[PDB]
């Protein structure tokens, strides 16, 4: 039995404003999962979901809604796991360290022979701290689904900042209907509104 | 970050009354966490005195209950400790400390410099 | 009188840099509850205020060196230091957060 | 005690032609580390190195030179670990699955205010199988050191291929001495010579 405690994505924190943290908690007595926060304030209505999957293992995850203002002042949220000798606990909180806003760069790949109806849009986001970064792709002023793009895990630059790449394949029908795509980065150091953007097109 | 600065300590006569203050900076005491008073007799052990939470709830150590009281001033972001009927047992260094909650049980994460109260 | 009383051992000890030190804390009543033990450990160097090293008996406060480790349960708790350092010459207190009023040990003084 | 068995980088296999595999093997009796291969051919002179690091742990890694031709025909190499009840064993071999050569794209970031002496060169390598891919950056026809660049871990595309990004910061002194940089990908499906390239410049 092992457990993990997630952080709120910058997208959930500053765009949706409805951030949440989820206690993963990956068998005779059902396992109880409760929440606590360092300030002593009450825990919101935490919704717990039990999943019977898959290879002879049980998954019980609890999602706890948190407040965006609370997370900024350094509120520590702790999750505890009890079974019918000792309990396991994970604690999540705002990352420490300096803040650095991201630089955002967008590029389009040239036409590749045989694949004329598809293109690849690449977004470089770099020199930001801390590493927590959300990426969304906008087309027609409407955000594209998340499954459409792929973002690499943050990695350290030669400086103290982190960088991330985002890759998005687009179809001809899309860029011909409107040849403009926006790669948006959500980071708490971005000012104002925690957003840095760049537009790209396919020629 | 949170910094606690005590004041109001000094020489005091028995049966008198003294008021100690803790000036908090970097965090508003009405926002959360517990705010406690813990005294130490020099050369001896440490004892918890009283606590006020961010909601105004007060909790006292029964060994001092009835003579002492803990107050809060949100506008000045300061909480106080009024002592009455001082005794030689009360001579001690008085720290204030911020309390972090862990499932209904508090630990003293940040402590002030402490101010000395001496009765004769 | 009805309080939980905390007794530490040893009261004082002399050590050298690099030594491994073990301090014990005994409680009148069990401070265990809900699968956790509400015993906290504090370090106090001379002339300064105590500092939190461990809470819940095993968890280390952020920024505390890894050499400090807590163990125990019920009425028996042990603060362990893997290797002693010059800045560790201080008094070490345990504190139970199970019942009001919160109480402290007498303190274990470590002299380098 | 846990152990890992590495694969030979495509760079070591097809460029250097001197590939090697290393048995990581991360305390009373010294641990013996021996090698074996499924074909029954003898194991080359395997150099073993013992490192006393760091937080009360011992590291003993053995590097085994392998032949580039052998790895292509599916030779399986196995590493076994013995302590003075049972032994641990890892086995490495050529990856299975279809082969797809990589597409390589190189881009340069525009000037960022305040950082006029530095630039960021980005290389996108995508649609390749299997995932094993090496990346090197060439400037002045001489390969730059590896610590100079950073390559993300392979990730799956919406198709069956993988993609990878490579990031390289360059200085003004470099591009002014010669404003041409080559991003080279080494992959066994690349034909011929297992290399796909693209050049980029800073304007
Ligand atoms: C603390 O919060 C209270 C209530 O919102 C407010 O009245 C007071 O002015 C605040 N003090 C400081 C120092 O921010």
Numbering used by the authors:
A (entry chain B), D (entry chain B): 336 to 361, 366 to 423, 426 to 544
B (entry chain E): 1 to 120
C (entry chain F): -1 to 110
Kindly provide excerpts from the paper associated with this entry.
Here, we investigate and engineer the weak disruptive activity of an existing therapeutic antibody, omalizumab, which targets IgE antibodies to block the allergic response. IgE antibodies underly allergic diseases such as allergic asthma, chronic urticaria (hives), chronic sinusitis and food allergy. Most antibody isotypes bind their Fc-receptors weakly and depend on the formation of avid immune complexes for stable interactions, however IgE binds its high-affinity receptor (FcεRI) with a KD of ~100 pM. Therapeutic anti-IgE antibodies (e.g., omalizumab and ligelizumab) were specifically selected to compete with IgE:FcεRI interactions, and not target IgE receptor complexes.
